[PDB]
Scaffold this motif. Structure first.
Motif, PDB file in Angstrom:
ATOM      1  N   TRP B 365       0.835  -1.466   0.433  1.00 43.66           N
ATOM      2  CA  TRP B 365      -0.002   0.029  -0.180  1.00 43.66           C
ATOM      3  C   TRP B 365       1.002   1.044   0.293  1.00 43.66           C
ATOM      4  O   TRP B 365       0.018   1.995  -0.628  1.00 43.66           O
ATOM      5  CB  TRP B 365      -1.018  -0.111   0.970  1.00 43.66           C
ATOM      6  CG  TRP B 365      -0.248   0.513   2.513  1.00 43.66           C
ATOM      7  CD1 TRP B 365       0.203  -0.327   3.038  1.00 43.66           C
ATOM      8  CD2 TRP B 365      -0.333   1.934   3.062  1.00 43.66           C
ATOM      9  NE1 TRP B 365       0.746   0.040   4.699  1.00 43.66           N
ATOM     10  CE2 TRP B 365       0.043   2.160   4.472  1.00 43.66           C
ATOM     11  CE3 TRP B 365      -0.837   3.484   2.022  1.00 43.66           C
ATOM     12  CZ2 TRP B 365       0.438   2.646   4.789  1.00 43.66           C
ATOM     13  CZ3 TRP B 365      -0.819   3.916   3.460  1.00 43.66           C
ATOM     14  CH2 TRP B 365       0.029   4.500   4.151  1.00 43.66           C
ATOM     15  N   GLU B 388       3.036  -6.605   6.320  1.00 44.95           N
ATOM     16  CA  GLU B 388       2.058  -6.712   6.634  1.00 44.95           C
ATOM     17  C   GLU B 388       1.150  -7.038   5.343  1.00 44.95           C
ATOM     18  O   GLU B 388      -0.120  -7.970   5.531  1.00 44.95           O
ATOM     19  CB  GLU B 388       0.585  -5.139   6.022  1.00 44.95           C
ATOM     20  CG  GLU B 388       1.656  -4.417   4.691  1.00 44.95           C
ATOM     21  CD  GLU B 388       2.534  -3.450   4.328  1.00 44.95           C
ATOM     22  OE1 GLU B 388       2.681  -3.110   3.332  1.00 44.95           O
ATOM     23  OE2 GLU B 388       3.325  -3.549   4.794  1.00 44.95           O
ATOM     24  N   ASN B 451       2.244  -0.315   9.397  1.00 46.09           N
ATOM     25  CA  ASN B 451       2.558  -1.382   8.602  1.00 46.09           C
ATOM     26  C   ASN B 451       2.440  -2.675   9.401  1.00 46.09           C
ATOM     27  O   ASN B 451       1.612  -3.382   9.282  1.00 46.09           O
ATOM     28  CB  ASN B 451       3.517  -2.083   8.119  1.00 46.09           C
ATOM     29  CG  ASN B 451       3.584  -0.290   6.997  1.00 46.09           C
ATOM     30  OD1 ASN B 451       4.390   1.022   7.277  1.00 46.09           O
ATOM     31  ND2 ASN B 451       4.091  -1.229   5.941  1.00 46.09           N
ATOM     32  N   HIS B 454      -1.162  -3.590  10.713  1.00 48.66           N
ATOM     33  CA  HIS B 454      -1.621  -4.074  10.116  1.00 48.66           C
ATOM     34  C   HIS B 454      -2.021  -5.312  10.916  1.00 48.66           C
ATOM     35  O   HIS B 454      -3.174  -6.195   9.778  1.00 48.66           O
ATOM     36  CB  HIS B 454      -1.810  -4.259   8.803  1.00 48.66           C
ATOM     37  CG  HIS B 454      -1.359  -3.023   7.778  1.00 48.66           C
ATOM     38  ND1 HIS B 454      -2.278  -2.895   6.507  1.00 48.66           N
ATOM     39  CD2 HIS B 454      -1.818  -1.505   8.225  1.00 48.66           C
ATOM     40  CE1 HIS B 454      -1.797  -1.464   6.378  1.00 48.66           C
ATOM     41  NE2 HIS B 454      -2.402  -0.631   7.980  1.00 48.66           N
ATOM     42  N   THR B 484       2.517   7.047   9.274  1.00 51.56           N
ATOM     43  CA  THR B 484       2.857   6.280   8.725  1.00 51.56           C
ATOM     44  C   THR B 484       4.233   5.480   9.254  1.00 51.56           C
ATOM     45  O   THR B 484       4.305   4.401   8.965  1.00 51.56           O
ATOM     46  CB  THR B 484       2.901   6.593   7.503  1.00 51.56           C
ATOM     47  OG1 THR B 484       3.353   7.636   6.589  1.00 51.56           O
ATOM     48  CG2 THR B 484       1.200   6.236   6.569  1.00 51.56           C
ATOM     49  N   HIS B 498       4.117   8.361   2.670  1.00 52.50           N
ATOM     50  CA  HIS B 498       4.643   6.895   3.089  1.00 52.50           C
ATOM     51  C   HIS B 498       5.478   6.914   4.271  1.00 52.50           C
ATOM     52  O   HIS B 498       5.252   5.730   4.286  1.00 52.50           O
ATOM     53  CB  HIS B 498       4.400   5.970   1.972  1.00 52.50           C
ATOM     54  CG  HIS B 498       3.721   5.742   1.290  1.00 52.50           C
ATOM     55  ND1 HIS B 498       3.164   5.610  -0.706  1.00 52.50           N
ATOM     56  CD2 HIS B 498       2.382   5.759   1.232  1.00 52.50           C
ATOM     57  CE1 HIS B 498       2.167   5.666  -0.790  1.00 52.50           C
ATOM     58  NE2 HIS B 498       1.379   5.641  -0.170  1.00 52.50           N
ATOM     59  N   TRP B 503      -3.045   8.177   7.989  1.00 49.64           N
ATOM     60  CA  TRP B 503      -3.959   7.853   6.806  1.00 49.64           C
ATOM     61  C   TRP B 503      -5.086   7.461   7.534  1.00 49.64           C
ATOM     62  O   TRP B 503      -5.578   6.618   8.497  1.00 49.64           O
ATOM     63  CB  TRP B 503      -3.031   6.827   5.662  1.00 49.64           C
ATOM     64  CG  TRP B 503      -2.415   7.195   4.540  1.00 49.64           C
ATOM     65  CD1 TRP B 503      -1.396   7.953   4.670  1.00 49.64           C
ATOM     66  CD2 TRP B 503      -2.047   6.695   3.134  1.00 49.64           C
ATOM     67  NE1 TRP B 503      -0.462   8.533   3.565  1.00 49.64           N
ATOM     68  CE2 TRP B 503      -1.012   7.826   2.770  1.00 49.64           C
ATOM     69  CE3 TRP B 503      -2.740   6.271   2.704  1.00 49.64           C
ATOM     70  CZ2 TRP B 503      -0.982   7.917   1.652  1.00 49.64           C
ATOM     71  CZ3 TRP B 503      -2.513   6.431   1.176  1.00 49.64           C
ATOM     72  CH2 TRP B 503      -1.726   7.313   0.322  1.00 49.64           C
ATOM     73  N   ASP B 506      -5.574   3.287   6.922  1.00 51.73           N
ATOM     74  CA  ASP B 506      -4.089   2.856   7.544  1.00 51.73           C
ATOM     75  C   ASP B 506      -4.448   2.761   9.275  1.00 51.73           C
ATOM     76  O   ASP B 506      -4.877   1.960   9.724  1.00 51.73           O
ATOM     77  CB  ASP B 506      -3.083   3.736   7.667  1.00 51.73           C
ATOM     78  CG  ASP B 506      -1.791   2.728   7.828  1.00 51.73           C
ATOM     79  OD1 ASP B 506      -1.638   1.727   8.126  1.00 51.73           O
ATOM     80  OD2 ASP B 506      -1.370   3.414   9.086  1.00 51.73           O
TER      81      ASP B 506
END
Lengths: 620, 620
Positions: B365, B388, B451, B454, B484, B498, B503, B506
């Protein structure tokens, strides 16, 4: 679009970038503009991307190339303040050099508008960052605190921002005014919260905007909080605007009626004086707090160029007591109240209450010079006896007697009321409708108007129902409200101030009176029409007025926010439900209404009113 | 500000006056811009006053001197249309002469963006009012119906309006496209309605805007309705965007998952091909419908430059069945579904699922070229195995076996899942956190990232709780969401695509997984933070991303509307309440949550969920 900040009698108008270009933009407080065409210039000069706005805070977002971002953030709580925060976005050092342009005419609001052909004020250029303009009413001072190297009336700065660093530069226009004028102000300052919740997002956005409109237009006085009238041209206490809208906000926020009564209790006329149209007992039209009004340079402090605000003042009190029970206040005001009704009755010495053209072309709510017309659109011979203000008067006196609000004769007052009731119908009824007014030697003016819709709530009408059905005919019912005149008349123009344009409060008054006479269904069609109007206007805000064509089209002179019209939203719900104050709080609604109200005020206690296929009334 | 109209794969961007100045403004449909820098010139040239906007209709209001008023009204339902209604306001005749400027590059959306350094398209100048551009995928036609004397690509008109009269002049850009492409479209077209109602005006304005965001970004296909990704740059079906957001909208609007599954069921890869990164079983990244993608000029129809969209596709189905019970669909798709899991497992032949930089710098992503970094901010050696997507894979396979979603081995799939679970924790856990990725010869990249958030929802983590508390440390928790990356890392910049930017989706994914592990309180702090963000942004709209500083500051590249982020609003509520689908629909909420949901979809029936100091679940 207009973006507006406003509170406690101060307001700002701007471009979205917080600029003060177009004529009507600037920082105002107590009817004296303090700053106008401010401008920000910093290079690399920015590239706007988006904005967000409340009424005490607005932010616009700016791109500065690709290595930069600006965030503009303007605020108003007495002081106006701009904050420019510069963001370095790429890992190279960033340079900016700012210099901010402002011009400080401590000019009065009439100077702004081309009233009397009045001058603009000169930039007064600061003396240690402090501008002062003197007038016998008081000293008028603007102070500026800033972190910019200031060069007269232009602020400067440059500094370079490290990579991923940021830089902030303030400016604060501190306005402070002494003299005849802060004898008025109260330091109370707390904000109301919306009380209507209908569970449709389109609709609830009306009420909540109604309520933030009302807060931005509240001035906090010694006597209580009182409504200011309107934001482009009317940023001061009017009496008709502040009384009417208090009546709308009577079943929800009574504190606003109790300030208007207490304020205009002391500003009542004590003398006769042709400068200011004063008379003993009369209640003023407007009461500006600029240097002009307080030193007598213009007669508006208070000006008494309206004759409706006097029977209105007493009806509202009769209503206020019908809702509150606050009998403490009314005999704090019953010296005020008898002096009101002895102004009424001796102006009924003549037979009707009438006005004569003066500074303003009329002295009803249609106070423009072409507002009152005849059957072919010429201004009729004065004195003018207006249909609406003969209704406020029957309504005035019948309650000053039904509730003993004065000290004069009791059923004497009601005797003259039924005198006038039968004298009214007889003298105004034209078979099909009531007449807009009689002229100076008595002949009626045969034009159908929304002014006659004002009498369903007075109960002076004996032909109540046929006044109704005429008001809803295709000549009077636009797709978004009852037009101020009819489209069949010779002098109908939909974009006129008072000759065909729709007005949220005018319709709302008519709706409150359709509730007195048990026509809740027609009041609902009248709420629907202007909400269908508020659904399609910016911020679902109800402005002063808009066009009467069957397509929604605003009116440029329309003032937004405006108090009686953003408060009409609530009056519309008091009539929506047929809500009355009696020995108890009754709700007999129109069909297909659906609403929860968490805070109806009646008798000093608050009730939860619910209308959802059935009606419930229970305390909080 | 950006004002945007958008529906059914078409969208417009504009100034407020409906102008198409700045680079990114124009009329688009199926990733081919059709018109750009349109301009209206009529004199007396107007003076703007105010505007109002939906997503299929916008109006701006114009003053024309004092004797005039313009109302601009632009609309989009397949066709783009402008209507200019001119109002004569004073009782003198009014003259206007119009001439409208537009330029019609039937160019592909990549040509727009400076992708591949691609050309802008030439104005194609119409042949009887009909422009055509040919490509082997199909004929690309723009038709114009107008009531202006048209002179090539400039429309003209003049006529004088009687006093209090009005004049209306249309223009309609009818776009119509044939070829490989309307094999996709369904004629179904009906719009969803919001289902969250929390009784705070600030908050409900988020959900309702969420829902009008989702409608403007819906394309109606043969297989069902499917989400388009984003409005400035991403106006076409992405797979990761369309799957994730379907999962968010799974407990409320399942119809959006069932289209994404059915669409990417047919666009699955059937072959190996290094042009488009295809592989047998793989699921695409994006699938544009421009002339460029369908004639093979760029490999994006479908491009297969992501390796997350393949385990995601199957997890979502495992989830969809957990909510819907629609087993009809899944064995309509179980040929699709086994071909998915045999792509997973033979890409686990290698040990992790990994990607190699290609056209896009990464294929997770964080698909930008500096998105994946090392401990000191250099791009690590490929192939990259992202933390992730190893979680989506455990999650993929454990459910393809728990629910028999494939035809391959059962507890075989779960054997390799627990293989990978213990292979994952071991290989990624660094005592304090999970690692962002391993590089091409296996060493971990020691940078803390969102990440790793996730994996709370995958259940691959065995150290679930300490992944949590690390994610909420001051280095990862901005005032408005989980950044992020972390601010302590060497290569942190808050305004990066990123590497530090917040986000909404996210954070929402992280919130859904804090709900799997019984930390509803932390999911709520994560909803709060980004709603506190949506409270202060224009139209309370959640854009793709915004800055990670502790003051809210947007990111210019941020795309708005954007599907996964305006749908995250609902995911945030699925985790707010800890809501799970099992044999029954359970709700074990976080403390101090208050919400009514009139239409939760579970097992094909809809329930009223209420959380108001107590929880109730009952059908509609």
């Amino acid at each position: 679009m207009r973006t507006i900040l406003a509170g406690n009698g101060a307001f700002v108008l701007s471009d979205e970038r917080g600029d003060m270009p177009s004529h009507y933009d600037g920082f105002y407080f107590l009817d004296t503009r303090f700053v106008r065409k401010a401008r920000l210039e910093v290079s690399p000069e920015p590239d706007f991307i988006g904005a967000s706005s409340t009424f005490t805070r607005a932010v616009s977002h700016f791109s500065l190339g690709e290595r930069g971002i600006l965030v503009r953030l303007r605020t108003l709580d007495g002081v106006y303040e701009e904050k420019l925060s510069f963001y370095n976005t790429s890992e190279e050092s960033l340079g900016v050099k700012v210099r901010y342009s402002y011009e400080a005419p401590i000019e009065d609001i009439f100077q702004v508008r081309g009233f009397m052909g009045l001058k603009s004020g000169k930039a007064i250029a600061p003396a240690g960052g402090t501008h002062v303009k003197e007038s016998p009413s008081g000293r008028r001072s603007l102070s500026i605190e800033t972190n910019m190297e200031r060069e007269g009336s232009l602020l400067r700065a440059e500094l370079e921002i490290p990579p991923l660093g940021k830089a902030v530069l303030y400016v604060r226009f501190i306005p402070k005014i002494e003299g005849s004028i802060s004898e008025i102000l109260g330091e109370k300052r707390k904000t109301i919260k919306n009380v209507a919740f209908t569970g449709s997002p389109a609709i609830d956005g009306i009420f909540e905007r109604a309520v933030e409109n009302i807060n931005a237009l509240t001035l906090f006085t010694r006597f209580g909080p009182v409504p200011l009238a309107g934001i482009p041209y009317f940023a001061c206490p009017f009496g008709r605007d502040a009384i009417i809208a208090s009546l709308f906000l009577l079943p929800y926020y009574p504190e606003y009626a109790a300030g208007t009564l207490r304020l205009f209790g002391r500003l009542q006329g004590k003398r006769t004086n042709p400068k200011n149209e004063e008379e003993p007992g009369k209640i003023p039209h407007e009461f500006r707090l600029g240097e002009l009004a307080q030193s007598g340079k213009v007669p508006f402090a208070p000006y008494y160029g309206t004759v409706d605000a006097t029977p209105l003042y007493v009806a509202l009190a009769g209503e206020y007591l019908r809702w509150t029970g606050d009998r403490k206040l009314i005999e704090e005001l019953r010296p005020n109240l008898t002096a009101a009704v002895e102004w009424i009755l001796k102006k009924l010495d003549d037979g009707y209450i009438t006005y004569v053209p003066g500074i303003l072309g009329n002295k009803g709510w249609k106070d423009s010079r072409d507002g009152i017309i005849d059957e072919e659109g010429k201004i009729p011979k004065p004195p003018i006896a207006l249909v609406e203000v003969q209704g406020y008067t029957y309504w005035a006196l019948k309650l000053a007697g039904e509730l003993s609000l004065t000290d004069l004769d009791e059923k004497t007052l009601l005797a003259e009321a039924e005198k006038l009731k039968k004298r009214f119908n007889r003298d105004f009824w034209l078979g099909s409708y009531y007449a807009l007014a009689l002229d100076g030697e008595g002949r009626p003016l045969r034009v159908v108007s929304s002014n006659m819709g004002h009498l369903l709530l007075t109960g002076i009408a004996e032909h109540e129902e046929e006044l109704a059905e005429r008001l809803f005919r295709p000549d009077m019912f636009s797709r978004y409200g009852i037009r101020t005149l009819s489209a069949k008349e010779k002098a109908y123009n939909p974009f006129s101030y008072h000759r065909g344009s729709v007005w949220p409060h005018d319709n709302a008054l008519i709706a409150l009176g359709l509730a007195r006479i048990g026509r809740t269904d027609m009041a609902k069609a009248l709420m629907d029409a202007v909400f269908d109007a508020a659904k399609l206007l910016p911020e679902r805000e109800l402005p002063e007025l808009y066009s009467g064509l069957n397509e929604l089209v605003p009116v440029p002179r329309a003032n937004s926010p405006q108090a009686w019209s953003s408060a009409s939203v609530f009056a519309f719900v008091t009539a929506s439900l047929g809500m009355e104050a009696g020995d108890e709080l009754t709700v007999r609604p129109a069909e297909g209404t659906s609403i929860v109200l968490r805070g109806v005020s009646f008798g000093g206690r608050r009730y939860v009113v619910v209308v959802n296929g059935g009606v419930s009334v229970e305390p909080l």
